[PDB]
Every structure is written in structure tokens, then in C-alpha cells.
């Protein structure tokens with residue numbers, strides 16, 4: 001199979017390290033497509049806006065349809081996510097993974113370049129929809145590819161280090177937003193590492209599991225000897241692409257074969273969609289809990305962006321031995337019991353508000369780090385379609401429902417949204433962390449996992 005030859009080969013070799021840096025340079029490009037609107041949505045105030053830079057609000061005249069503008073903008077981005085979920089979930093299974101990712105990166109690069117010189121607001125909306133759709137496809141495909149590519153005992157290292165790469169992408173976005181004469185300079189500076197990825201994407205291999213599922217043993221042997229020659233060692237071909245006698249046709253029934261696995265997979269994928277929805281809603285509620293500003297213009301966003309590194313390092317230290325479901329329970333209970341304190345009286349002589357908000361964030365970031373890792377480890381039949389469906393098709397619902405509901409609630413009553421978010425999160429997502437599946441150090445992706453699971 002793949003795990004035995006991966007253990008017999010260098011799982012963390014130097015070629016693996018340069019491929020890791022290349023897909024990390026992919027990972028830092030996912031910051032502004034999801035969170036960079038805060039650096040593009042400055043609203044300082046015949047309408048005159050006093051700011052040395054500019055924004056979309058300064059560019060247009062958003063004084064009577066300002067609420068109709070940005071809400072529809074982010075709703076169209078999340079609709080682009082909604083199309084892109086099913087789109088890449090079937091397209092990666094159809095035309096493979098690596099060529100899909102390369103073409104999708106090229107489309108992202110040309111779409112960002114054309115976004116930098118957007119003529120009209122209709123072009124703005126269309127390009128934002130296409131950008132969101134493509135960028136979500138790129139990031140999820142890259143994360144799945146490198147989760148599969150690394151060996152058995154080093155999945156978490158890769159996953160947590162790429163969440164760290166996303167964090168340093170937000171940090172570099174905050175550092176870049178200091179030099180903001182127009183949004184165009186920011187977008188043009190962001191779009192250049194995508195071309196760097198395209199330039200240095202000629203020396204990256206495919207996914208051995210998906211390639212082996214195509215019964216192409218020759219190119220599997222080719223990529224194994226390429227990996228061995230890159231590390232400069234003779235490969236101990238114990239299996240020699242044995243393929244475990246796999247002959248099942250790829251994409252036989254994506255999400256249609258779950259009827260035979262109803263008592264064993266339906267409840268698991270349901271609780272996974274529940275946990276994704278809870279993470280998205282709680283995350284957005286904690287961002288809007290101050291409305292992305294608290295006495296500052298950039299320091300609040302840095303506090304909401306540099307908080308991920310302590311959570312990531314805590315996860316990397318913690319989840320090696322205790323498992324991957326107890327971290328879910330600890331993170332969920334900590335987030336709930338941290339956000340529940342804001343109902344109490346504000347700190348008269350201390351900083352309890354920022355303390356509970358930062359520890360709640362830490363809990364939510366530990367939860368989001370894991371949700372992706374356990375999703376990649378699970379859905380053993382085909383990790384692409386089902387994994388994207390649980391990842392993105394129940395996060396776009398959070399993106400379309402969560403800001404409108406909490407905005408209207410904070411317009412009418414502060415107490416209801418925080419209480420409902422805390423109750424739903426704490427109770428339901430702590431019940432959700434009650435072993436959806438048995439955890440194993442190995443990472444196979446065959447249907448034998450679905451029918452056995454140890």
C-alpha cells in the first residue's frame with residue numbers, strides 16, 4: 001500500500017520540505033479572499049471622507065444603500081462558495097487533483113489581476129463570486145493533497161503548520177494594509193504570490209492514493225523513484241506499488257452510496273456538518289462581538305489575528321497523545337464558558353471583557369484547526385466530495401445567515417444572539433465531541449475503513 005512504503009521512505013525529507021513550503025505559499029494566499037474585506041471596507045464617515053488611503057466605500061457613494069451594498073457583496077461571495085463546493089467536489093474527482101489545482105490557481109491569478117482593474121460594481125460582484133469559488137477550491141484541494149501526501153504519523157504536523165501558515169497570512173495582510181493608498185495596491189500585492197506558486201509549481205508531485213485508485217502503477221513507481229532520488233536514497237520497495245488489489249472505479253456513487261452505509265456513516269457526517277456550522281456561526285459571532293473594532297483600527301484586528309498562534313502551538317503540543325476528540329470537547333467547552341461571561345457585568349476595574357473574548361477566540365481557533373484535520377481523516381470512501389460538502393456547503397449557510405441575523409439582533413436586542421450562540425455551541429457541540437469515529441494514527445482512504453474502522 002502507501003503507508004508501508006511511506007514509512008520505509010522519508011516522510012519528512014528535504015523534497016517534502018520544499019513541497020511543504022510551496023503549498024504553504026499557497027496557504028498564505030487564502031487570507032484576503034475571506035477576511036481581507038475589513039482592510040477593503042474602511043468607512044471613516046456632497047460626501048467627503050477623511051482618510052489618506054481609500055476603500056470601496058470611499059470609491060462609491062455608500063450613504064443610503066451602504067447596508068445594501070456590503071451585505072450583498074459578502075452574500076455573493078458566499079453564493080460563490082455555494083456553487084464552488086459542489087463544483088470542485090465533482091471536478092477534482094473527475095479531472096484529478098494536481099492538474100485541477102494548477103488550472104484553478106491560474107484562474108485565480110488572472111481573476112485577481114482583472115479584479116485589480118475592475119471597471120464597474122457589477123464586475124466587482126461577478127469577480128468576487130468567481131474569486132471566492134476558485135479560492136475555496138484551491139485551498140481545500142491543496143490541504144487534502146498535502147494531508148494525503150504526508151506519512152502516517154505526521155498528519156497533524158502538516159495540518160497545524162498550515163493553519164499557522166494561514167495565521168501568518170493574516171499577519172502579513174495586516175502588515176501590508178499599512179501601505180494602503182488604494183485597495184488596488186493591496187490586491188495587486190496579494191495576487192503576486194499566486195503567480196509565484198504557478199512559477200514554482202512545476203516540481204510538485206500528485207497524490208499517491210488518488211493516483212493509485214486509477215490503477216496506474218507505472219506512474220506510481222515513477223513518483224516513488226523520483227521521491228527516492230530527490231532524497232538521494234535507494235528505495236526499499238517492500239510493496240512496490242502493491243495497490244492492495246484495488247480495482248474499484250473512482251466516482252462510482254459520490255454521496256449516492258451512503259444508503260448502504262446509513263447506520264455507520266450518516267450520523268457521523270451529520271454531526272460533522274453540525275460542528276462545521278457551529279464553528280462558522282461562533283467564529284463570526286465572536287468577530288462581530290466587537291464589530292471588528294475596539295478602540296483601535298489595526299490593533300483589534302491584529303489581536304484577532306495573532307491569537308491563533310498560541311492556540312496552534314497548544315494544539316500541536318496537545319493532540320499528539322490525548323487524541324483528537326478530547327481536544328474538540330475541551331475547545332468547545334472552553335469557548336462556551338468563555339463567551340458566556342460577557343452576559344455578566346462588564347469589568348469595572350479590569351480587562352475581563354478582552355480576556356474572555358481572547359480566550360473564546362483561542363477556543364474557536366483550536367476547534368477550527370481540528371475540524372479540518374478530522375474531516376480529512378474521515379469520509380474514507382472519497383475525501384474530496386464528502387469532505388468539501390461537510391466543509392464548505394455548511395459554512396456558506398453560516399456566511400449567508402450569521403451576519404444578517406446577529407446584525408438585526410444587535411439592532412433589536414443584544415441578549416438573544418449571545419445566549420443562543422452560547423447555548424447551541426456549548427450544549428450541542430459538546431455533545432458532538434463524543435467520539436464520532438474511532439481515532440487511528442494511520443491515514444488510509446479506502447472503503448475498508450468505512451466497513452471496518454478497526
Ligand SMILES: CN(C)C(=N)NC(=N)N
Pocket residue numbers: 034035279280283368
Ligand atoms: C477563512 N474564513 C472565511 C473564516 N471565516 N475562518 C474561520 N475561522 N471561520
